[PDB]
């Protein structure tokens, strides 16, 4: 399905650091399986395509007549084996549109 901010999703296999629930940087263990995270970010601009819905651009479909918008990454907490123990860490889970304005 088509959205207002084009998302790009994947498996993060090399995350070694992350900011935890307290605002601090914690070491992310490389394995436990082997420790992965499912991450979601915004699409980056593409020179053949252009137009809206990308990474730090105006969101597809918003009315430019009344609004100024921006696709930005949204974060959530995932349980992670860190350093040693399970800690909640911030990972990118979506590209959401924000209306910062009132054109």
Query: Do you know the residue count of the chain?
Result: 103
Q: Which is nearer to its own copies, 1 or 48 (CB)?
A: 1
How many whole angstroms from its chain centre is CA 76? 9
Q: Does 7 bind Cl ion (CB under 5 A)?
A: no
Q: Does 42 bind Cl ion (CB under 5 A)?
A: no
| Shortest distance in whole angstroms from residue 5 CB to Cl ion | 5
CA-wise closest residue to 98 among 63, 72, 60: 72
Q: Is-contact 39 91, C-beta < 8 A?
A: yes
Residues 6+ apart with CB under 8 A from 2: 60
- The number of residues that bind Cl ion (CB under 5 A) is 3
Q: Which is nearer to its own copies, 45 or 74 (CB)?
A: 74
The interface mask with Cl ion, positions 83-102, x = CB under 5 A, is -------------xx-----
Enumerate binding residues for Cl ion (CB under 5 A).
Answer: 4, 96-97
């Amino acid at each position: 399905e088509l959205a207002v901010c084009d998302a790009v999703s994947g498996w993060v296999t090399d995350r070694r650091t992350a900011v935890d629930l307290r605002g601090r940087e914690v070491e992310v263990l490389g394995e436990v399986l082997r420790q992965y995270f499912f991450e979601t970010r915004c699409k980056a601009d593409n020179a053949e395509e252009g137009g809206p819905g990308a990474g730090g651009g105006g969101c597809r479909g918003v009315d430019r007549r009344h609004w100024v918008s921006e696709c930005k990454a949204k974060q959530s907490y995932v349980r992670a084996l860190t350093a040693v123990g399970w800690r909640w860490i911030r990972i990118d889970t979506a590209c959401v549109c924000t209306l910062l304005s009132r054109t």
